[PDB]
Design a protein around this ligand. Structure first.
Ligand code: CA
Ligand code: CA
Length: 686
């Protein structure tokens, strides 16, 4: 099918996701309502159980509210069974209405619905061209206390009914026991508890296997995507082996939550997004958009710079999940005023790079503070709101215009309160002019674009005070007046001649796995897929359309490659870099090194005989390794996803500045496991 089909689990750029907090959306079946002190019919107490369930969600689907909006995907609350306990925090009673306090990843939450209810959810949505993304929190279980078993549910972890263990008396070692986290360091915040949430020990074979088994169950259910929780509070090494597990099996678009504060740029966030095998939330995009349209703590210059920087930092920026607000921030809309700001941001976000998300109720101009004041129940389902329209107008541009789903981003006109950017993909253009100044009308002159010559009517139909554009020869738009707080969208579409790739996914898998190349001008006739230098043609190319191709990863050596297509004729497309062919199925193995003394700025990295280990390249070495929590310096440690059932030769190195000091002697060798975790404790060879 076309890259624009509901069937495409690997691509989400052309969609518009709608983030729904299940319990605060629609109550379609009163039956599953929690009782007693855990329920609040009125939803007046934003910390109890309101009644939101899968049923209600289906009800909004077939009723037109969702589809009307032009929404194409829904990311819901964690489907899994949560704890029933009614925890009390310094007086206030709380619940797992949020869906993060899990007890059993193999069962559903009765409140949300039953397996059937869920399956009904997947079928109801699929029937309408709506994708389904589920939240999955493999980080912790629930709140617990080592010294107090009776509190809550002792972070107990079940396995489809059969009790695995609990925080207290963790003899199996399913959990971590290094106290809570202070967020001081990336390492510290991984191996230590988050508040009171009993951290899971993925280093345990029992926990690693089980979790990789829970997601599959959901996989086989119908989900078209996952939303990893606390991707920052989980061992990067282990996450990659998780992704490897999903990919090598039933690949699906996966993104995670790596919070970012105002003006916050983490080189670590980039590396995770780039190499993990999954995208992340675009806090970088979101944080700035707010400073530019809501709190106004930066100008369009701050906006442009972000757009540019981000574009080079993330290897697959067209994979980041953009938004203006969510569960972890207050509502973009200030009760106080000017809704035009929200709408401008809304306009901004849906016509920009990446996959746009929309927090439920945003189209209703919802207020509130930080959680729980940002999870109130949707106050109405009216389709007359200007924000619903705006979404209803620009949303489908991701499906109809490719420059918007795969285009690039270039500034073309800008000052303090104005920004005129253009998306460009093949012979597809689109220019979005935005005037944030709410008190003045901007006068633009000298604006140049890629649009052909002719008139261009504002897609928004003057909805945001946007005008019709007059583009003369050369692409030199006439002198027009951008209305105050105005917003306009002119675009140009056209058949694309040469093969152009706009997407690839999964971006990480072993040989045999089937990838989904997306773009335009591939031709209706089967061609050939090049994986670096190796070609792919014939029966190994499961499918070929003008928009999307489906080939099987060739039997090549694990490592980074380039994807490039050549239509039946022989014409070579554009190159798509950063594809990782794994040496095979993966496992999470923790590496240990003794007496690795060092000096300031000098750290320890790990390299090895596998692509997964950097193939001996020091530029591609693993680390810097950790050395404070689990193990203490001079002992260094690190969790690395390695090829399963393979004899590996490794050697440690130390780096300080650009200078590398190698380990002495011959490589240490060991044999990774064909399943589960494993630890390798060795000593530094002088
Ligand atoms: Ca209900
Ligand atoms: Ca953790």
């Amino acid at each position: 099918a076309p890259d624009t089909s509901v069937s495409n689990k690997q691509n989400f750029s052309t969609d518009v996701i709608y983030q729904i907090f299940t319990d605060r959306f629609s109550d379609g079946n009163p039956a599953n309502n929690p009782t007693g002190a855990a329920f609040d019919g009125t939803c007046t107490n934003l910390r109890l159980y309101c009644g939101g369930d899968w049923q209600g969600i289906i009800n909004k689907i077939n009723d037109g509210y969702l589809t009307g909006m032009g929404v194409t995907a829904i990311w819901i609350s964690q489907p899994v069974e949560n704890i029933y306990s009614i925890i009390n925090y310094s007086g206030v009673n709380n619940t797992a209405y949020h869906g993060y306090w899990a007890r059993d990843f193999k069962k559903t939450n009765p409140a949300y619905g039953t397996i059937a209810d869920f399956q009904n959810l997947i079928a109801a949505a699929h029937a309408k061209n709506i994708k389904v993304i589920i939240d999955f929190a493999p980080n912790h279980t629930s709140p617990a206390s080592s010294d107090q078993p009776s509190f809550a549910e002792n972070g107990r972890l079940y396995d489809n009914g059969t009790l695995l263990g609990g925080y207290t008396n963790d003899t199996q070692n399913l959990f971590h026991h290094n106290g809570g986290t202070d967020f001081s360091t990336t390492e510290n915040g991984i191996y230590k508890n988050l508040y009171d949430l009993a951290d899971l020990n993925h280093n345990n074979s029992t926990v690693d296997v089980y979790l990789k088994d829970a997601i599959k169950m959901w996989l086989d259910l119908g989900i078209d995507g996952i939303r990893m929780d606390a991707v920052k509070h989980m061992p990067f090494g282990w996450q990659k082996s998780f992704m490897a597990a999903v990919n090598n099996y039933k690949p699906v678009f996966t993104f995670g939550e790596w919070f970012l504060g105002v003006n916050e740029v983490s080189p670590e966030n980039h590396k995770f997004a780039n190499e993990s095998g999954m995208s992340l939330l675009d806090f970088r995009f979101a944080q700035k958009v707010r400073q530019v349209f809501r709190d106004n703590t930066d100008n369009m210059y701050g906006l442009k710079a972000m757009l540019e920087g981000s574009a080079a930092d993330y290897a697959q920026v067209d994979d980041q999940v953009t938004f203006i607000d969510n569960h972890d921030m207050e509502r973009f809309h200030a009760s106080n005023a000017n809704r035009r700001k929200l709408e401008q941001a809304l306009a901004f976000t849906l016509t920009s790079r990446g996959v746009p998300a929309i927090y439920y109720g945003t189209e209703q101009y919802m207020s509130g503070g930080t959680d729980p004041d940002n999870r109130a129940r949707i106050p109405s389902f009216s389709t007359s709101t200007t924000a619903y329209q705006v979404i209803q107008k620009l949303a489908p541009l991701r499906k109809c215009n490719p420059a918007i789903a795969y285009g690039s981003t270039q500034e073309r006109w800008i000052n303090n309160d104005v920004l005129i950017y253009e998306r460009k993909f093949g012979s597809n253009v689109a220019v979005v002019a935005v005037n944030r100044n709410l008190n003045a009308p901007a006068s633009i002159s000298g604006l140049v674009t890629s649009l052909p010559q002719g008139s261009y009517n504002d897609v928004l139909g003057g909805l945001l005070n946007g005008n019709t554009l007059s583009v003369g020869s050369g692409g030199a738009a006439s002198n027009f007046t951008l209305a105050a707080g105005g917003t306009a969208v002119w675009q140009y579409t056209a058949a694309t001649a040469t093969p152009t790739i706009g997407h690839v996914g999964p971006m990480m898998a072993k040989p045999g796995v089937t990838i989904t190349i997306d773009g335009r001008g591939f031709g209706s006739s089967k061609g050939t897929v090049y994986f670096g230098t190796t070609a792919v043609s014939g029966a190994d190319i499961t499918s070929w359309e003008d928009t999307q191709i489906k080939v099987k990863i060739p039997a090549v050596a694990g490592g980074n490659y380039n994807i490039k297509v050549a239509n039946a004729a022989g014409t070579a497309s554009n190159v798509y870099d950063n594809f990782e062919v794994l040496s095979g199925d993966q496992v999470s193995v923790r590496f240990v090194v003794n007496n690795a003394t060092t000096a300031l700025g000098q750290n320890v990295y790990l390299t090895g005989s596998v692509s997964e280990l950097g193939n001996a390249d020091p530029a591609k070495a693993i680390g810097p390794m950790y050395n404070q929590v689990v193990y203490q310096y001079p002992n260094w440690y690190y969790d690395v996803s390695v090829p399963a059932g393979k004899t590996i030769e490794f050697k440690f190195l130390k780096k300080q500045g650009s200078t590398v000091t190698w380990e002495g002697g011959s490589n240490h060798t060991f044999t990774a496991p064909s399943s589960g975790t494993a630890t390798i404790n060795v000593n530094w060879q002088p």
